[PDB]
Design an enzyme around this catalytic site. Structure first.
Site, PDB file in Angstrom:
ATOM      1  N   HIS A  68     -12.575   6.716   1.849  1.00 54.12           N
ATOM      2  CA  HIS A  68     -11.175   6.966   2.265  1.00 54.12           C
ATOM      3  C   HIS A  68     -11.058   7.232   3.773  1.00 54.12           C
ATOM      4  CE1 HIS A  68     -10.564   7.621  -2.118  1.00 54.12           C
ATOM      5  NE2 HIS A  68      -9.457   6.901  -1.842  1.00 54.12           N
ATOM      6  N   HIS A  72     -10.682   1.617   5.334  1.00 56.14           N
ATOM      7  CA  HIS A  72      -9.823   1.472   4.122  1.00 56.14           C
ATOM      8  C   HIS A  72      -8.361   1.276   4.520  1.00 56.14           C
ATOM      9  CE1 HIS A  72      -8.251   2.014   0.099  1.00 56.14           C
ATOM     10  NE2 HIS A  72      -7.570   3.087   0.500  1.00 56.14           N
ATOM     11  N   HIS A 106      -1.458   5.462   4.580  1.00 58.04           N
ATOM     12  CA  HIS A 106      -1.274   5.882   3.166  1.00 58.04           C
ATOM     13  C   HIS A 106      -2.337   6.912   2.736  1.00 58.04           C
ATOM     14  CE1 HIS A 106      -4.469   3.171   2.073  1.00 58.04           C
ATOM     15  NE2 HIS A 106      -4.470   3.703   0.884  1.00 58.04           N
ATOM     16  N   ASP A 107      -3.482   7.008   3.414  1.00 57.35           N
ATOM     17  CA  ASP A 107      -4.536   8.004   3.034  1.00 57.35           C
ATOM     18  C   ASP A 107      -4.878   8.950   4.213  1.00 57.35           C
ATOM     19  OD1 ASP A 107      -5.300   7.698   0.261  1.00 57.35           O
ATOM     20  OD2 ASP A 107      -6.477   5.935   0.765  1.00 57.35           O
ATOM     21  N   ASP A 217      -3.967  -1.223  -2.327  1.00 57.75           N
ATOM     22  CA  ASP A 217      -4.910  -0.083  -2.396  1.00 57.75           C
ATOM     23  C   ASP A 217      -6.171  -0.438  -3.171  1.00 57.75           C
ATOM     24  OD1 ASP A 217      -5.629   2.515  -1.698  1.00 57.75           O
ATOM     25  OD2 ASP A 217      -4.564   3.350  -3.462  1.00 57.75           O
ATOM     26  N   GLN A 269     -16.980  -0.187 -14.677  1.00 56.81           N
ATOM     27  CA  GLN A 269     -16.270  -1.270 -13.931  1.00 56.81           C
ATOM     28  C   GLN A 269     -15.484  -2.145 -14.915  1.00 56.81           C
ATOM     29  OE1 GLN A 269     -16.008  -1.872 -10.285  1.00 56.81           O
ATOM     30  NE2 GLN A 269     -16.356   0.313 -10.571  1.00 56.81           N
TER      31      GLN A 269
HETATM   32  C1  K9F Z   1     -12.747   4.092 -14.568  1.00 58.65           C
HETATM   33  N1  K9F Z   1     -14.145   4.090 -14.205  1.00 58.65           N
HETATM   34  C2  K9F Z   1     -15.086   4.737 -14.881  1.00 58.65           C
HETATM   35  C3  K9F Z   1     -16.299   4.521 -14.229  1.00 58.65           C
HETATM   36  C4  K9F Z   1     -17.609   5.064 -14.656  1.00 58.65           C
HETATM   37  C5  K9F Z   1     -18.692   4.923 -13.837  1.00 58.65           C
HETATM   38  C6  K9F Z   1     -19.903   5.439 -14.198  1.00 58.65           C
HETATM   39  C7  K9F Z   1     -20.067   6.106 -15.433  1.00 58.65           C
HETATM   40  C8  K9F Z   1     -18.996   6.227 -16.234  1.00 58.65           C
HETATM   41  C9  K9F Z   1     -17.735   5.742 -15.857  1.00 58.65           C
HETATM   42  N2  K9F Z   1     -16.085   3.796 -13.140  1.00 58.65           N
HETATM   43  C10 K9F Z   1     -14.725   3.509 -13.096  1.00 58.65           C
HETATM   44  C11 K9F Z   1     -14.015   2.684 -12.007  1.00 58.65           C
HETATM   45  C12 K9F Z   1     -14.262   3.372 -10.591  1.00 58.65           C
HETATM   46  C13 K9F Z   1     -13.068   3.223  -9.730  1.00 58.65           C
HETATM   47  C14 K9F Z   1     -12.093   4.151  -9.681  1.00 58.65           C
HETATM   48  C15 K9F Z   1     -10.930   3.984  -8.839  1.00 58.65           C
HETATM   49  C16 K9F Z   1     -10.817   2.913  -8.040  1.00 58.65           C
HETATM   50  C17 K9F Z   1     -11.813   1.912  -8.122  1.00 58.65           C
HETATM   51  N3  K9F Z   1     -11.680   0.811  -7.357  1.00 58.65           N
HETATM   52  C18 K9F Z   1     -12.664  -0.128  -7.436  1.00 58.65           C
HETATM   53  C19 K9F Z   1     -13.821   0.024  -8.290  1.00 58.65           C
HETATM   54  N4  K9F Z   1     -13.949   1.079  -9.055  1.00 58.65           N
HETATM   55  C20 K9F Z   1     -12.924   2.064  -8.924  1.00 58.65           C
HETATM   56 MG    MG Z   2      -4.868   7.600  -1.699  1.00 53.00          MG
HETATM   57 ZN    ZN Z   3      -6.079   4.294  -0.541  1.00 45.85          ZN
END
Ligand code: K9F
Ligand code: MG
Ligand code: ZN
Length: 313
Positions: A68, A72, A106-107, A217, A269
């Protein structure tokens, strides 16, 4: 007045594309932003000296955090530039002005921690702003910088145009709270599918700009795979430090923020692409057909995470 910004040939061509990566040369990012304002808004939108001073005070107010950060801010402004340039006639003059600024700001002053961690820590910002905590702070930091001497890039607007542009910026920044995305997108889904969506309805334009903000974003998922994959490293470097700080407060973090559960990133992911990203770019493409390349790139990246799970990388 007669002073255009110009980019090297490769950047001049590739900056028009949704999947453009702004590069590792931090000193070129201000020039890239001014280039984008001049083409998406006009050479007359802003006084160059004031715009340059605004940009450099915004830069100074981003922190040296893994994700952030100032890179970004400029990345999110570029995705907005690509949307605006592919939808020439849909947006007002004030929207063009407000939205690149909103994306750059925005951040502002992000600390690398979620709203949820500020509330659990009992940070002062969580008492000042009970919902969308960081996003209310980002808008507050944007107004502060606009009020510094020689930083009023909107000074030539009427009192009511000035109020309108600050309202576009405020709503666009609040919309980057992902907690608000789910409901905004469902309402846009129902409106598009029942044929009630009306771009002359201000409350409808607000929703469509909110979705543009989520799309910009999250735009790491719309890049070429090596960019997507290396950006994911920075995203998790923040989440895992927040998970460490959750453990220091005596709270088991969610798996997404627990470095001990790194092995589950590929499946996390998939969830994210299916529950957030693909639905975002799908609805955006229904409303703004020329944004389809964002959706196509997101699907290409989902397919790459599926290969990672199959041990093909
Ligand atoms: C939902 N979620 C769970 C997990 C997870 C990982 C490891 C172990 C268990 C769960 N990773 C995500 C997405 C992460 C993530 C969050 C926010 C923005 C993102 N923008 C791009 C790529 N990823 C982003
Ligand atoms: Mg933000
Ligand atoms: Zn952002």
């Amino acid at each position: 007045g007669l002073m255009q910004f110009t980019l090297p040939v490769r950047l001049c061509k590739e900056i028009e594309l949704f999947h453009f990566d702004i590069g590792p040369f931090e000193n070129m990012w201000p020039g890239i932003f001014v280039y984008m304002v001049h083409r998406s808004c006009g050479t007359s939108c802003f006084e160059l000296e004031k715009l340059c001073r605004f940009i450099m005070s915004v830069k100074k107010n981003y922190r040296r955090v893994p994700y952030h950060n100032w890179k970004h801010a400029v990345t999110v402004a570029h995705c907005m530039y690509a949307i605006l340039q592919n939808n020439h006639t849909l947006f007002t003059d004030l929207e063009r002005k407000g939205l690149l600024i909103a994306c750059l700001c925005h951040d502002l002053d992000h600390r690398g921690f979620s709203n949820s961690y500020l509330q659990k820590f009992d940070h002062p910002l969580a008492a000042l702003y009970s919902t969308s905590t960081m996003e209310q702070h980002h808008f507050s930091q944007t107004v502060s910088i606009l009020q510094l001497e020689g930083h009023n890039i909107f000074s030539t607007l009427s009192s009511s145009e000035y109020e309108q542009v600050l309202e576009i910026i405020r709503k666009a920044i609040i919309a980057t709270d992902l907690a608000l995305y789910f409901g905004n997108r469902k309402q846009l889904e129902e409106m598009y599918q029942t044929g009630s969506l009306n771009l002359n309805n201000q409350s409808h334009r607000d929703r469509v700009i909110g979705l543009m903000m989520t799309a910009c974003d999250l735009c790491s998922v719309t890049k070429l795979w090596p960019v997507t994959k290396l950006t994911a490293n920075d995203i998790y470097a923040e989440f895992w430090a927040e998970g460490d700080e959750m453990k220091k407060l005596g709270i088991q973090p969610i798996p997404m923020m627990d470095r001990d559960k790194k092995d589950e990133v590929p499946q996390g992911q998939l969830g994210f692409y299916n529950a957030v990203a693909i639905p975002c770019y799908t609805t955006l493409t229904q409303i703004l057909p020329p944004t389809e390349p964002l959706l196509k790139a997101c699907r290409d990246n989902l397919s790459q995470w599926e290969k990672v799970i199959r041990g093909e990388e």
